Amino acid sequence: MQVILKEDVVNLGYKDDIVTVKDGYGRNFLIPQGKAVIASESAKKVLAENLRQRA
């Protein structure tokens, strides 16, 4: 899986960054508990736009 972080997570951090994870760690923990979301193209574009605007 590829996920865009929505919070800070120990051992894989950088809140609001794109990181690849195992499918289970991210389908069964991260997304349901609210840390990170799936890294679809729309989400990637939205995050890129926000980072570009805040740069």
Partner 1 sequence: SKICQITGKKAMVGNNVSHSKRRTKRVFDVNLFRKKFYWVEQDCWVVLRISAAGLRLINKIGLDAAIKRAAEKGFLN
Which residues here bind RNA, judged by CB under 7 A? 11-12, 21-25, 27-29, 32-33
Q: How far apart are CA 22 and CA 20, in angstroms?
A: 7
Instruction: Measure the CA angle with vertex 45, ends 44 and 50; round to 5°.
Output: 100
Query: Which residues pair with residue 18 across a beta bridge?
Result: 4
Taking CB under 8 A as the criterion, the residue among 12, 16, 19, 27 binding partner 1 is: 27
Tokens representing 17 are 């960054």
Q: In angstroms, what is the minimal distance from the CB of 52 to RNA?
A: 31
Residue 29 interacts, among partner 1, RNA, none and using kind-specific CB cut-offs from 5 to 8 Å, with RNA
The one segment of 11-19, 31-39, 45-53 that binds partner 1 by CB under 8 A = 31-39
